[PDB]
């Protein structure tokens, strides 16, 4: 590069990666790398696991998407062979099973927990689509025409935030660049071209709403995060959709993501452009529980471990994925361990050489993550047992 600092930075990345590759047998129990035709902006493991009898591997599936320059975009279902002859002329195959025609890049794709065949998608346009992949062929049509099972109206702009209610069937939330949060009941009688209008529109934010998340236990409770630096807590039982139950001045920059703790009904996390992950207690949102510092750039995704209550991970533009352990907060460290980071930082994943777009914890196999980057790479990996043990 033209700048010395720029040329060094590009070289350090390439050099760090070569070291990461050579050190993978020390840090991981599993590393699987796959280069997708196009980069995916989304990643989410489907909940099902198919164990073939007398086979040394199980088949896991994952929802992916495409992001292309000028080609036909697709919603993808990929199969992954994980441990429960394998030589290619690398160890476990990653394959695209379903390709469903999509209009524009898939900003986010999430399955409905009550019917995992149903997947809502965020488009680069105002509509939010719904697809039943069993109501579509495995091979897409060269017609290139996107035929969603439902078109959800209410937004004026594209977005990323998307969350299905785990306790209330068909209740879908969506966040948009238009500053709104839309709610739909996909069970409502559609109209026109399978078009369902927003049941409610929440207008509390005064900037781009980056994410939405339903509380995992209270079916009426959800949280939102925006570029206005706020975290907002909403109750659908209230009739005022312009004022949230709580407004939290969460960060010193844009708030890009949030995730509720799957084991503690009061604990929640937010990720920000201020390069920190904040911990929140719904019982006292005026005071921040803790700040996770060590990310070297804007954070875009936060996800709690589906298996361990004290574990969460964050990813962003710094091309790294950090895994944090709440139980290690305020622990004593030797001066040598202290220089590597805070005790709460359990692991740094340096497998990606580009911005991490999304990641997903495998719900059936503990410590397995799938992360997708802007350079088309998708990694299925698992840190070494010794990292989280002893």
């Amino acid at each position: 590069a033209e700048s010395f600092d720029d040329a060094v930075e590009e070289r350090v990345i390439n050099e760090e990666y070569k070291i990461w590759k050579k050190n993978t047998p020390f840090l991981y129990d599993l590393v699987m790398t796959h280069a997708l035709e196009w980069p995916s902006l989304t990643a989410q493991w489907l909940p099902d696991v198919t164990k073939q009898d007398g086979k040394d591997y199980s088949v896991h599936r994952l929802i992916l998407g495409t992001h292309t320059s000028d080609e036909q975009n697709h919603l993808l279902i990929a199969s992954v062979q994980l441990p429960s002859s394998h030589y290619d002329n690398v160890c476990g195959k990653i394959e695209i099973e379903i390709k469903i025609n999509h209009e524009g890049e898939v900003n986010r794709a999430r399955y409905m927990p009550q019917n995992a065949c149903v997947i809502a998608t965020k488009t680069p346009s105002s509509d939010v689509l719904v697809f039943d992949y069993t109501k579509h062929p495995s091979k897409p049509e060269p017609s290139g025409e996107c035929q969603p099972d439902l078109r959800l109206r209410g937004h004026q702009k594209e977005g990323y935030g998307l969350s299905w209610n785990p306790n209330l069937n068909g209740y879908l939330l969506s966040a948009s660049d238009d500053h709104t949060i839309c709610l739909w009941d996909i069970n409502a009688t559609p109209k026109e071209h399978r078009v369902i209008d927003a049941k409610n529109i929440f207008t509390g934010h005064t900037a781009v709403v980056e994410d939405v998340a339903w509380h995992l236990l209270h079916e009426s409770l959800f949280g939102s995060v925006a570029d206005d630096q706020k975290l907002m807590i909403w109750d659908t039982r209230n009739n005022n959709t312009s004022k949230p139950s709580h407004t939290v001045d969460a960060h010193t920059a844009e708030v890009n993501c949030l995730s509720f703790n799957p084991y503690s009904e009061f604990i929640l996390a937010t990720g920000s452009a201020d390069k920190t992950v904040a911990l929140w207690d719904l019982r006292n949102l005026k005071l921040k529980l803790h700040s996770f510092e060590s990310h070297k750039d804007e954070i875009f995704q936060v996800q709690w471990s589906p298996h361990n209550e004290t574990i969460l991970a964050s990813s962003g533009t710094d091309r790294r994925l950090h895994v944090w352990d709440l139980s290690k907060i305020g622990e004593e460290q030797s001066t040598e361990d202290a220089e590597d980071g805070p005790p709460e930082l359990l692991f740094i994943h340096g497998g990606h050489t580009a911005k991490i777009s999304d990641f997903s914890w495998n719900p059936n196999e503990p410590w397995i993550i799938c992360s997708v980057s802007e350079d088309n790479i998708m990694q299925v990996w698992q840190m070494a047992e010794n990292v989280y043990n002893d």
Binding site: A35, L36, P39, H67, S69, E105, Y160, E254, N256, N376
Partner: peptide, 15 residues
């Protein structure tokens, strides 16, 4: 807000 990169096609390797 996030800026989407100008996506590159893979031939079975990075971008």
């Amino acid at each position: 807000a996030r800026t989407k990169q100008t996506a590159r096609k893979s031939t079975g390797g990075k971008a």
